[PDB]
Amino acid sequence: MRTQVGIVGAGPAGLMLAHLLRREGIDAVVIERAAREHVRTRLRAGVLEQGTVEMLREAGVGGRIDAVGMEMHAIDFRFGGRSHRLDFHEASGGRRAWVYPQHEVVTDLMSACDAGDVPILYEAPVERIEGLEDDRARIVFGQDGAAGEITCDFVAGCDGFRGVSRGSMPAGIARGYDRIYPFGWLGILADAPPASPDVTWGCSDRGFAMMSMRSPTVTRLYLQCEPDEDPDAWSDDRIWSELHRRLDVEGMPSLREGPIRDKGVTAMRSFLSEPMQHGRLFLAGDAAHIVPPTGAKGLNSAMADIKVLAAALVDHYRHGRSDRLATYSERCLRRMWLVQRFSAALTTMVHQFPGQNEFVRRLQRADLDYMTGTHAGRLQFAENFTGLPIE
Amino acid sequence: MRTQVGIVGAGPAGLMLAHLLRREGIDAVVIERAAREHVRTRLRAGVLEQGTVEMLREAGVGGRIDAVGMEMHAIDFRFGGRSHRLDFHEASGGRRAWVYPQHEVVTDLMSACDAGDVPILYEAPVERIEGLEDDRARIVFGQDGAAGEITCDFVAGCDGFRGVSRGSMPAGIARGYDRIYPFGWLGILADAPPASPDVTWGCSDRGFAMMSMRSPTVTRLYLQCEPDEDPDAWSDDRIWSELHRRLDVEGMPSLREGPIRDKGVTAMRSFLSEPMQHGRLFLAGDAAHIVPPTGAKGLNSAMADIKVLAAALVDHYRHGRSDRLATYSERCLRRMWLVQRFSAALTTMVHQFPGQNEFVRRLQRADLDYMTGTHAGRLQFAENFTGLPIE
Ligand SMILES: Cc1cc2nc3c(=O)[nH]c(=O)nc-3n(C[C@H](O)[C@H](O)[C@H](O)COP(=O)(O)OP(=O)(O)OC[C@H]3O[C@@H](n4cnc5c(N)ncnc54)[C@H](O)[C@@H]3O)c2cc1C
Ligand SMILES: Cc1cc2nc3c(=O)[nH]c(=O)nc-3n(C[C@H](O)[C@H](O)[C@H](O)COP(=O)(O)OP(=O)(O)OC[C@H]3O[C@@H](n4cnc5c(N)ncnc54)[C@H](O)[C@@H]3O)c2cc1C
Ligand SMILES: [Ca+2]
C-alpha cells in the first residue's frame, strides 16, 4: 500500500517500467484493471524498432527476441501495378526492425516481473489518482467491490488510451490534439504461408491493404474499410477479392488464400496530450498519445517514454537529481511529435480518403514515387521506421 | 501566315521556345494577346533554379545574372521565435539558386527574339486552335474585329493559366487537377535594405511572411492574406507592422522599413492538366500547370517544359524522329507532379489555415522541425528547391 512508484496499467509500458525499476532497486506496484490471463492472451502483431530491441536486450529480457525475433529489412510498397521494395536496412546505414508480436513482449515482461517478485494487482481498476502535488500521491482503486489505495512518490500513467491517468491531469493544464481518420482497418488471419517474405503494402487507388507474416503458416492481412464497418459485411470471397485487387501485381506471385480467422476492425486516429507530466503524475505510452498503426510506432513510442521515465526516476532516487524528471515531458514530446508526423504522413499517403480533392489524391502517388524512388525519400522513411533517437 | 511552330503567348515559356527554335534554324511565330510592355513588367520577382540558370546561359541570355542576379545558398526559416538557417548549398552537395526576377528574364528573352528577327504579334488574342489531328494546325487570332490566321506544323500552348490553348483539346481528352488554398499573398517592393543576408521565411502562427532581396537597396516582401484581400485595407504602416510580427526574431537584425512601391494581391492555387499534348498541340508552362509560389517553381517548371519541347522539336526537324515529341507529356508530367508535391508541401507547412484541425496545424511545426533539424529533411528540401532533374 506504500511504494515509490505506483504504476497504473499492466500493458507493455507499465510492465517494462516495473521491470526496469526492480533491477534498479526502486520499489513499484502495478495496478491492472483486467485479469492476468486477459492481458497475456491479448494478441496483437508486433514490429519493434531497433532501439526497442536494444532496450529489451539491455534489461535482460531480450533472450527470446534474440532467439526467434524475425529481422526485418524491407517493405514492398505496391502501387502503379508494380512492386517497390524499399530496403530500409540499407537506406538507414545498417538499422532495421524485428517482427515480434506484442503478446510475446508482454509475456516476456510478465515473466520478468513475476521472476522479480514485482507486485501486480489484477482485476483492480483504478478509479482516481489524487495528491499530485501532495507529500505523496494516492492511487484509488477497487478489486472486487472492496476499495484500495496505493501511496507513492510518483504515479506512472501506463493505462492506455482508454485509461484513467490522462483524465487525472488538471483541466487547466492538459491540452489535446486529436484527428480521426475517415477509415479503419479490417484485419484477418489467413491459414496460409505468405506469398512473399517481405511486409507488403497495397497503396493503389482502390484502397489500402497490408500483408505480413504472423507465423510460418499464418498470414496477417489488413484492408482499409469504413470507420464503422461491420466485419459481417465482408465475406471470405469479398475479402480475398479486394485483397487480390489491392495487392497483386504482375511479376510477383498471387495472393495465398486460405481459411480466414480473427476478423476484426481497428480504428485510425492521431492523438497527443500535453503535457506528459504534472506534479507526481507521469504519463507514458497510449495514455499520453496514440498513432495510426500505419508506421508501427505505438508500442515503440511507449518503450521510448519508459526509457526516459525510468532513467529520470533512477536519477532521482539513486543520484538525488530531479532535473531529468522535470524534463520528462519536454523530451518525450519532441520525439513523439516527430513520431506523430511520420505516422500521419504514412497514413495520409497510403489510404484513400472518400471524396478527397482530386489534386491531393494524385499527390499520394507523387509522395509514393518520391519516397521509394529517391535517395532522400528512402532515407527519411528508413530512419523514421527503424526508430528515431531517444533523448 | 505560315510557319513551322506556332507559339500562342509571349510569356517566358513562349519567348524561350521561340529563341531556342531560332538558334537551331526552326521558324516560329509568336502571338500575344496583351501589349509588349504589359507582358514584360507583369511580375517583378522570381527565384531561379540552377538548371534554369544554366539553360539561360547556354541559350545566350544569361550574361546579366552575375550582376543583376542574387545567388542564394540558404533560407532562414524563422519559427518558434528563432532562426533556422537551412544551407541548401551544402545540403545539395553544391547546387544553389538565384534571385533573378521574371521581368529581367523576359527582357532578356525579348532582346534575343528581337536580335534574331522572331516575329511576335502583340495585342492579337488567339481565339481558336484547330487542325490538331489534321496535316497542319491553324491558329485563329483577332484584332479589332479582324480575324487573322496562322498555319503551322505544331502549336505551342504557352498562353498561361488564363490562356485558350488548354481548352483547345478535343472533348474528353483533358483532365484537370485543381486545389485552391484559403489565402493569398500581399506582395510589396520596398526601398529598404535587407535586414539579413539570406532570404527569410516567416513561418509564424500569425501567418506566412517572406523577405526576399531584389538588390542591396530593394527588398521583396510577401504577407499571407485573405484570398480576395483588398490591398486598400493595408496601409504602409500596417504592412510593416505585420511584417515585423511575422519575421522579427530576437538576436537577429530587425526588418528595415522604407517607401513601398509595388503592391498587389496574388492567389495561391495548385493546378495541373493532363495530357500536355494532343496531336500537333503542345502545352508548356502555366498553360498546363500552375503552383503556389511558395517554392519558386512556376517559371522554372515552364523552362523545364520548354527545354524538353525545344529538344523534341529539334529532334523532329533535324533527325526526322518524333519519338521525343511522343514522350513530351510523359516526361514533363513526371517532373511536374514532383514539383507540385514540393510546392504543395511547403505551402501547407508555412501558411496558417483558418479553422484547421489542431493536430494537423501542430504538425506544421513538426514538419518545420524535421525539415530544418535533420539531414534527411534538409537533403530533400535542398534537392527540390534548387531544382529536380529535367530529363
Ligand atoms: C492493430 C495494431 C497494430 C499495432 N502494431 C504495432 C507495431 O507493429 N509496432 C508498435 O510499436 N506498435 C504497434 N501498435 C501500437 C501498440 O499496440 C500500442 O501503442 C501499445 O499497446 C501501447 O501500450 P501501452 O502499455 O501504452 O497501452 P496498453 O497496451 O493499452 O496498456 C494499458 C493497460 O492498462 C490497463 N488499464 C486501462 N485502464 C485502467 C485502469 N483504470 N486501471 C488500471 N489499469 C487500467 C489496460 O487493461 C491495459 O492492460 C499497434 C496497435 C494496433 C491497434
Ligand atoms: C507572385 C508570384 C511569384 C512567383 N515567383 C516565382 C518564382 O520565384 N519562381 C518561379 O519559377 N516562378 C514564380 N512564379 C510563377 C511564374 O511567374 C509563372 O509560372 C510564369 O509566368 C509562367 O510562364 P508562362 O509563359 O508559362 O505563363 P505566362 O507568364 O502567364 O505567359 C502567358 C502569356 O500568354 C498570353 N496569353 C494568354 N492568353 C492568350 C491568348 N488567348 N492568346 C494569346 N496570348 C495569350 C498572356 O498575356 C501572357 O503574356 C510566381 C508567380 C507569382 C504570381
Ligand atoms: Ca496530505
Nearest to A364 by CA among A375, A382, A352, A376: A352
**For residues A70 and A46, is the Cβ–Cβ distance under 8 A?**
no
If one counts the domains in chain B, the total is 1
Task: Give domain status of residue A259, yes or no.
Answer: yes
* The three grid cell numbers given for residue A59, joined into one nine-digit string: 534489461
- Dihedral sign for Cα B180, B186, B189, B192, please: negative
Does A362 contact B177 at a Cβ distance shorter than 8 Å? Answer: yes
Residue A114 CB coordination number (10 Å): 12
Nearest CA to ligand 1 atom 17: A299
Q: Which of A263, A282, A286, A342 to mutate to test the pocket of ligand 1 (most atoms within 8 A of CB)?
A: A286
> Which residues in chain B have Cβ-Cβ distances shorter than 8 Å to A176?
358
Per-residue burial over B248-263, b if 16 or more Cβ lie within 10 Å, else e, is: bbeeeeebebeebeee
Report the distance separating Cα B336 and Cα B177, nearest Å.
Answer: 12
Closest B-chain CA to A367:
B341
Number of CB atoms found within 10 A of residue B110's CB: 19
Taking any CB pair shorter than 8 Å as contact, residues of chain A touching chain B are 176-179, 270-272, 334, 337-338, 340-341, 344, 357-360, 362-363, 365-367, 369-370, 374-377, 379-380, 383
Q: Give the domain CATH number at A29.
A: 3.50.50.60
Ligand number with the minimum distance to the CA of A280: 3
Beta carbons of A265 and A218 less than 8 angstroms apart: no
Cα-based angle A64, A289, A68 (whole degrees, multiple of 5): 10
Q: Which three cell numbers stand for residue A99?
A: 517482427
Pairing relationship of beta strands B147-152 and B137-142 according to DSSP bridges: antiparallel
A206 CB-contact burial (10 Å; exposed 0-12 / middle 13-18 / buried 19+): exposed
CA atoms within 13 A on the CB side of A390: 21
What 3 state SS string does B204-242 have?
Answer: ECCEEEEEECCCCCCEEEEEEECCCCCHHHCCHHHHHHH
Distance CA A297, CA A269 (A): 13
Which atom of ligand 1 is nearest to A286's Cα? Answer: 26
Helices (H) and strands (E) in chain B, counts: 12, 20
Verify that A142 and A251 share a domain, yes or no. Answer: no
Q: Please give the single-letter amino acid code of residue A333.
A: L
A286 and A327 housed in the same domain: yes
CA nearest neighbour of A318 among A92, A4, A97: A4
Map B255-266 to HEC letters. Answer: CCCCCEEEEEEE
Cell of B47: 527565384
CA distance B84 to B370: 11
How many C-beta neighbours within 10 Å does residue A145 have? 5
Answer whether B6 contacts ligand 2 (Cβ < 6 A).
Answer: no
Q: At what angle do helices B12-23 and B102-115 cross, to 10 degrees?
A: 30
Task: State in Å: Cα B101 to ligand 2 middle.
Answer: 12
d(CA B19, CA B113): 6
> Last residue of some domain: A266, A301, A327?
A266
Q: Strands across the sheet with B28-31, in order?
A: B120-121, B28-31, B5-8, B154-157, B281-283, B277-278
Joined together, the cell numbers standing for residue A141 give 482503486
CA distances from A363 to A33, A184, B179, B298 (A): 44, 21, 11, 17
Cell 530593394 -> residue: B218
Nearest CA-CA distance, residue A302 and chain B, Å: 19
Chain A contacts of B344, Cβ < 8 Å?
A: 360, 363
Rg (CA), chain A: 21
A250 and A331 housed in the same domain: no
Contact predicate A226/A355, CB 8 Å = no
Instruction: Kindly state whether residues A280 and A325 are assigned to the same domain.
Output: yes
Which residues on neighbouring strands pair with residue B2, listed in sequence order? B151
Helix (H, G, I), strand (E, B) or coil at B71: strand
User: Are residues A121 and A27 part of one domain?
Assistant: yes
**Distance from the CA of A34 to the center of ligand 3, in angstroms?**
30
Q: Is any atom of ligand 2 closer than 6 Å to the C-beta of B160?
A: yes
CB-based contact A300:A48 (threshold 8 Å): yes
Question: With the CA atoms of A267, B371, A360 and A241 taken in that order, what torsion angle do they form, in degrees rounded to the nearest 10?
Answer: -40
Tell me, yes or no, whether A130 and A16 share the same domain. Answer: yes
User: Rounded CA gap, B301 and B303, in Å?
Assistant: 5
Indicate whether A161 and A205 sit together in one domain.
no
Residues A248 and A307 reside in one and the same domain:
no
Give all strands of the β-sheet with A47-49 in edge-to-edge order. Answer: A47-49, A97-99, A70-72
Question: How far, in Å, from the CA of A129 to the mean position of ligand 2?
Answer: 63
- One-letter amino acid identity for B312? A
**Could you tell me if A262 and A298 lie in one domain?**
no
Which of B4, B9, B88 is CA-nearest to residue B283?
A: B9
B131 C-alpha to center of ligand 2: Å?
26
Ligand whose nearest atom lies closest to the CA of A103 = 1
Three-class SS of residue B279? coil
**Residue A124 to residue A141: CA distance in whole angstroms:** 6
Q: Whose CA is nearest to atom 38 of ligand 2?
A: B163
From B385, B301, B291, B299, select the one nearest B43 (Cα to Cα).
B299
Range A324-332, long-range pairs (CB < 8 A, 24+ positions)? A325/A277, A325/A282, A328/A276, A328/A277, A328/A282, A329/A274, A329/A275, A329/A276, A329/A277, A329/A282, A331/A391, A332/A276, A332/A284, A332/A288, A332/A304, A332/A305, A332/A308
What are the C-alpha distances in Å from A385 to residues A89, A272, B344? 10, 19, 24
| Distance in Å, alpha carbon of B358 to nearest chain A alpha carbon | 6
A359/B383 CB distance under 8 A: no
**CA-proximal residue: ligand 2, atom 49 (nearest):** B11
| DSSP type of residue B121 | E
Q: Which atom of ligand 2 is nearest to the CA of B305?
A: 26
A384 within a domain of the structure (yes/no): no
Tell me the ligand closest to B165's alpha carbon: 2
Could you tell me the distance, in angstroms and rounded to a whole number, from the CA of residue A284 to the centre of ligand 3?
A: 25
Please name the residue of chain A whose CA is at the shortest distance from the CA of residue B178. A359
Residue A371 falls within a domain, yes or no? no
Residue A330 lies in a domain: yes
Closest CA to A68 of A111, A104, A114, A106: A104
Breaks (C-N over 2.5 A) in chain B follow: none
Interface test with B, best of A380, A381, A384 (most B CBs within 10 A): A380
Task: State the alpha helices, DSSP H only, in B65-219.
Answer: 65-68, 88-91, 102-115
Q: Output Rg (C-alpha) for chain B, integer angstroms.
A: 21
- Distance from A373 to chain B by nearest Cα, in Å? 11
CA of B222 to the centre of ligand 2 (A): 18
Q: How far does the CA of residue A334 sit from the closest CA of chain B (Å)?
A: 9
In a domain, A303, yes or no: yes
B185, B36 Cβ separation under 8 angstroms: no
A366: closest CA of chain B, how far (Å): 6
Closest chain A residue by Cα to residue B363: A341
Domain limit, last residue, from A266, A298, A325 = A266
Nearest to B373 by CA among A372, A383, A328, A52: A383
| B273 vs A335: CA distance, rounded Å | 40
Establish whether residue A8 lines the binding site of ligand 1, counting it when its CB lies within 6 angstroms of any ligand atom: yes
Tell me how close the Cα of B376 comes to any Cα of chain A, in angstroms: 5
CA B42 to the chain's CA centroid:
12
A-B contacts (CB, under 8 Å): 78
* Nearest-angstrom CA–CA distance, A147 and A150: 11
For the record, the C-alpha cell of A239 comes out as 475479402
Cβ–Cβ < 8 Å for B141, B125:
yes
**Residue A315 in contact with residue A325, Cβ under 8 Å?**
yes
DSSP state for residue A164 in the 8-state scheme: S
Distance of alpha carbon B227 from alpha carbon B179, whole angstroms: 13
* Distance from the alpha carbon of residue B304 to the mean position of ligand 2, in angstroms: 14
What DSSP letter does each residue of A259-303 carry, written as one string?
Answer: -EEEEEEE--EEEEEE-SEETTEEE-GGGTEE--GGGS-HHHHHH
Asked if residue A167 and residue A145 are part of one domain, the reply reads yes
Do B52 and B300 form a contact (C-beta atoms < 8 A)? Answer: yes
Report which ligand 2 atom has the smallest distance to the Cα of B43.
17
Taking alpha carbons only, the member of B377, B79, B120 closest to residue B247 is: B79
A245 and A334 share a domain?
A: no
A280 with A332, same domain: the answer is yes
Task: Say if B340 falls within a structural domain.
Answer: yes
Q: Residue A349: list chain B partners with CB under 8 A.
A: none
- Displacement of CA B162 from its chain's centroid (Å): 15
Mutate to test the pocket of ligand 2, among B75, B102, B126 (most ligand atoms within 8 A of CB): B102
Residue A227 sits in a domain whose CATH number is 3.30.9.10
Interface touch A337/B366, C-beta < 8 Å: yes
Task: Identify the three-state secondary structure at position A326.
Answer: helix
Q: Is residue A358 part of a domain?
A: no
Which residue range forms the structural domain that includes residue B35?
A: 5-71+99-178+269-352
**CB within 8 Å of B157: residues ≥ 6 apart:** B8, B9, B129, B163, B165, B166, B168, B281, B282, B283, B284, B287, B288
Angle between helices A328-350 and A375-386 (to 10 degrees): 130
Provide the CB-side half-sphere exposure for A286 (13 A, CA).
19
Interface of B with A (CB under 8 A): 177-179, 270-272, 337-338, 340-341, 344, 357-360, 362-363, 365-367, 369-370, 374-377, 379-380, 383
In a domain, A212, yes or no: yes
Residue B381's SS3 state is helix
Domain boundary among A266, A298, A332: A266
Cβ–ligand 2 distance for B101 under 6 Å, the answer no
Q: Is the CB of A158 under 6 A from ligand 1?
A: yes
Name which residue sits closest to atom 21 of ligand 2, judged by CA: B299
Establish whether residue A10 lines the binding site of ligand 1, counting it when its CB lies within 6 angstroms of any ligand atom.
Answer: yes
- Torsion-angle region of B344 (φ positive above 0: left; ψ -120 to 50: alpha; else: beta): alpha
